Symmetry: none
């Protein structure tokens, strides 16, 4: 939880394609000193992993859509079971248990407007305990970065 590392944190999420060469340079250390420090950050918990970003506008997935799901609270394992079922599906980026008129907010991604339809009713609406599902297609995404705010 050292403060000096915060720089190694921001730059790292800024360009995962930065080896000790440039990573352990812009910071203010040598290719070994803190490069072993950013390594410790990978185990400490900070860095959970690394990944590359892509533009679905290319790979069949140029269509993003959110889905509000409201399932009827029946058996105590209502959510527990749901979560341990929705995760087993990769065609859905996110999913959160919120508070209000609905319970979950899935963020599924698909190619065409036709694809999504097929996703729901076949599996999405086939999830355990679902009762109502309001679909919201995004006509324009103006911001999307899992990057946090490191000072």
């Amino acid at each position: 939880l050292d403060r000096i590392d915060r720089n190694i944190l921001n730059e790292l999420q800024k360009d995962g394609r930065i080896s000790n060469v440039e990573l352990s340079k812009r910071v203010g250390l040598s290719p070994t000193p803190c490069l072993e420090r950013v390594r410790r950050l990978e185990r400490q918990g900070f860095i959970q992993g690394y990944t590359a970003l892509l533009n679905p506008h290319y790979l069949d997935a140029s269509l993003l859509v959110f889905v509000e799901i409201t399932l009827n609270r029946g058996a105590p394992d209502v959510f527990e079971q749901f979560n341990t079922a929705v995760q087993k599906l990769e065609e859905i980026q996110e999913c959160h248990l919120v508070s209000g008129d609905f319970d979950y907010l899935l963020k599924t991604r698909v190619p065409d407007m036709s694809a999504y339809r097929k996703l729901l009713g076949e599996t999405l609406l086939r999830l355990p305990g679902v009762n109502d599902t309001r679909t919201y297609v995004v006509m324009e995404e103006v911001k999307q970065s899992n990057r946090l705010v490191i000072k």
Copy 2:
């Protein structure tokens, strides 16, 4: 739109921090032969870039919250203004313009439940055009991966 490149992609996202040789190790290729190919993907538009994923639990953003915002269609630049004004605010991660009741959906991470009350109506409600702002706090984030679905085929 290549074949082997697909596995390349799937591999890079399954693990971004990979060495040149390792990146072309279990893919079915030779070191020098195919490891720089990724550059054409980065030049064209396949690879948008690379980034590290940190745990918001161990950083100053332990709390997450969504918001349904509705912009008042006053001037045609109603949307244009919102967009070119919400980006500057690093407090919010994802921002979308959807169809339906509300118009925008913002996924924001405020360190504390109060911080959000602060973010809201001090830099949030004061956004270019806005009628209502229904907020939905997340009690349990169960899935969160910006990873797409690359399928060999």
Copy 3:
């Protein structure tokens, strides 16, 4: 308004590509007798015209979307002017002045989810007098026939 013509009406909208050869045959007359009758129906008002149907799933227009528009009643020519402005736009199949929470129901058609966005705010939301616009994209069209019901 002859009854016997109703058959010539249904078949005609059933296959516009039916010349006197087959059209003036299935009915029960000769290639001349009523073929001159279906001609009269074209002037009488019944037949307004003929057209061919296509599947946008091919030609860039595989994305259909409805838009509820609610404009603030300001000057008496509020609708009059609107209608004499929205018609001058071809990228919109239908448009009706309804009664209720909103005033109009446009049926615009476009290629990608990105196209539509560009349509609105640039022109759609630029229409004279508009104040609120709720967008509804169709994820699945299960029926679409301008065909009426002739008995």
Copy 4:
């Protein structure tokens, strides 16, 4: 995806009832040379078919009305059932499955305002799954053309 075929299409829709030669008259082609080409479009999938457009004002369908229907998500076959049950009803023209509040949008033409009250709750409300049905009658239809947008280019 041809060039001249585009003008062909635009012409056919601008006027379906056209003779073989006339269909290839002002397009920039010769009679026999290009008039049967349309067949490949009809065989492939470009031309869905031809139809005549009659005035609902002079027929027994002078009145038009839209309806926002919401189906209750009970069984996954909730949609499948609605679909394979609304087609059989020739009383309704267009039926769509949209996203948002309600789920379906039906454009129907009932001869008289009463006829609709009849159509509704006698063959309408009794459809496979349904919670609410908000109706919006049309006071003035200003635009109605199934014509698409073919642009030369």
Copy 5:
């Protein structure tokens, strides 16, 4: 252009509604024809259905019913007859003079007349919300009645 409604029967109708107690004799004078021909005339109108009946008008102020209020009933459909069950259930309460099934955000527009506000509050819910399956209700108390005439528009040409 049909209907073919007698140029004279029209005036008859307009007259009867304008005044529902007019004598046939005077009536026949106001329309021209002899008394007898007018009687079997209004009769054939009162027969067909053009005329549903006659009634007297009372002052909603001289009798406990001064307060007039409108209500909007948006009910939940779930028994393909709900609109019928509801309808054939509001015809039993004289405390409501008009019930209509309109399109839009709500389904029913009711016109109710009660003496007090608390008289309405009573009618509301204790008999109103309890009506055949209904979600919520919007209430609009009349502040002033500028126009109110059940008179139709007979085109006496």
Copy 6:
């Protein structure tokens, strides 16, 4: 209030065209006796007058439509203007000023849906300072009686 009177009113309300010889038989009294009572029952102000009921469907007013009208909150006088200016309009059968999200509620009848579109805007929207105007066509007028509730006890 005289019970026989209250009974006269009721009977009369049920049907006023009835003869005194009949109205007398109902209340159980000689013709003249209460016929002079129904007379004073008028003069006093209990009976605003008599009228016949006509079926709109048979004539020309099958389309009954209620309109919700709101006025500009600017000049306060507008309302008083609106009032004495909306009575003249024959097509407007009833107009009430209520308290709530809107200001007035007009009950109008017309033949064609077009007729309405004509009324609205050519004269309806041109009314003394009008802001909003929401329309509600009726699908079924399940009840319409100006009859009050008199208790014959």
Copy 7:
């Protein structure tokens, strides 16, 4: 009610920890005199007791959340069960049974948003015959005083 008493209550409500020597100075009377009054003021039942106010933020209860709970309309006894079974739950600060779209309203406090997710479902959803359960986290508790309104006049 004695004005001095009503004044004693109020003063006491404002702050009860104050000494009698002080509470006596406020009401303008010798210590003993009304100190015996505040005593009978207790015994009678006007004062349910005394308590200190603690800031939740400082301790561990910065997340205050209200939950709307509905029960199964089956067995009527459930409610009586729910009641005497929900009091034991320390995390549930307040529970009221109201009339409306839902049955109860519980005010609970927890440290982490996780803590809530834990409560809800592990014990909260396991309550005596519960049907629906809508949660409402609070962003700002702008007012919280069990103080009543006593009129010192």
Copy 8:
């Protein structure tokens, strides 16, 4: 794991809330330490902020306030301070003991106490709906109070 709250100050707190009039002496006995050390102890707690103050509890039944009702206020945002203007405006009416700004379908959850139903009806609108810009309101009358304790949860370990 911080805060570092004295194992003894905790019991102090729990005690003070359990009973707000306890004598310091008795208090010091209940926690162990001598009276004096306990006094400058509760003081440093009453100083920092752990303790906001002391109050007596009155019977909402022996005083006109028997009826308790909850209301849900969903207001319209349009003056980026509306939430502040509203908040700093509900703190002037003692007839409302709890006002919270929660997420979801509505914005405010208020807890109001009035003697009569008509007393509430009065508070409602005449002072309620008139509050700093608010759309509509939902009302929930308490039928029975099963649990009600402002007591927090001090972990005396």
